[PDB]
Amino acid sequence: RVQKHRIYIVATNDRDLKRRIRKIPGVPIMSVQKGKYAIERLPGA
């Protein structure tokens, strides 16, 4: 889905899917970090 359209923010927490979606340019990764969420590769935030 993300490879086709690439408008999404992928919210995961497993490092396998995180490393899989870090290879493709321009999708942010949202993951919960025990107090709140944390967005990874979004430039505007």
């Binding site: 889905r1 923010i9 995961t12 949202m30 919960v32 969420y37 967005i39 430039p43």
Partner: protein, 48 residues
């Protein structure tokens, strides 16, 4: 794809489309944490 300037996605502007995985969903219920409210408090923007 259009709206891609060298690994900078210009297609994502608010309201942010956020795909949710099962690991993220199980852990955001486990951490007593409301899903849309915490996503909006993280991004400071309206998510769908």
């Amino acid at each position: 794809p259009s709206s891609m300037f060298f690994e900078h996605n210009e297609a994502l502007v608010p309201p942010y489309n956020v795909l949710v995985d099962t690991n993220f969903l199980s852990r955001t219920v486990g951490a007593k944490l409301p899903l849309l409210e915490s996503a909006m408090d993280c991004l400071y923007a309206s998510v769908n």
